């Protein structure tokens, strides 16, 4: 029996266009060009789910620098201090959540400064 192959295709090509909203110009009404862009998004949406493991550290660590220079300390003397102040686990994201409560943050800082000496 012969296959027409009528609606096998036209259902599939619009599962790519509906994943292709918002694009510049002629990449939201073409199959052959948005399919080079749904694919190309897939690497980008993959490999930039791992920079949130990186460019949040780079967002967290310089805030801890900034909390340290109003205390005279480094980023080194904090984290090397906190390994000896306690054996504390403060996971540099939530270190900033004490920074925005800076009255309580420096009790965590100057305790390590006493444990620097």
């Amino acid at each position: 029996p012969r296959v027409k192959g009528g609606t096998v295709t036209r259902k599939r090509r619009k599962k790519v266009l509906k994943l292709a909203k918002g694009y510049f110009g002629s990449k939201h009404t073409l199959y052959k060009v948005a399919n080079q862009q749904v694919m190309k998004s897939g690497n980008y949406a993959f490999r930039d789910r791992r920079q949130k493991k990186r460019d949040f550290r780079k967002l967290w660590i310089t805030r801890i620098n900034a909390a340290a220079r109003m205390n005279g300390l480094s980023y080194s003397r904090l984290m090397h201090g906190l390994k000896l102040s306690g054996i504390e686990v403060n996971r540099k994201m939530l270190a900033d959540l004490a920074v925005n409560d800076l009255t309580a943050f420096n009790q965590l800082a100057d305790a390590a400064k006493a444990q620097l000496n």
Binding site: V38, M39, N43, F46, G86, N90, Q107
Partner: protein, 101 residues
């Protein structure tokens, strides 16, 4: 205000607020205690890697669903490689209560 360890991640915890935390061993009606607590706050009582003593802040487990759908389409450009795998991450809608400060 607690900082509790559940699945290797910690969250700044306010009592009475829903926080999306990892899947665990409850059945949507339980009050699972969190014992790995540090920096209680408010009265500023910390214990430096022991946990804060006798302070096992509980919660109440509400709901366990799945996340918004994420599909990886990881293709290697030349030499004809595709890889198309969806991933529904499960979670637990955790309603937090009873700071045991």
């Amino acid at each position: 205000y607690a900082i509790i360890k559940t699945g290797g991640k910690q969250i700044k915890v306010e009592e009475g607020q829903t926080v999306y935390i990892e899947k665990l061993a409850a059945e949507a009606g339980e009050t699972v205690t969190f014992e790995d607590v540090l920096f209680v706050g408010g009265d500023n009582v910390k214990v430096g890697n022991p946990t804060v003593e006798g302070a096992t802040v509980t919660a109440k487990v509400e709901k366990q669903g799945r996340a918004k759908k994420i599909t990886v389409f990881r293709y290697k450009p030349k030499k004809n490689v595709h890889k198309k795998q969806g991933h529904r991450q499960p979670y637990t809608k955790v309603t937090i209560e009873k700071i045991n400060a």
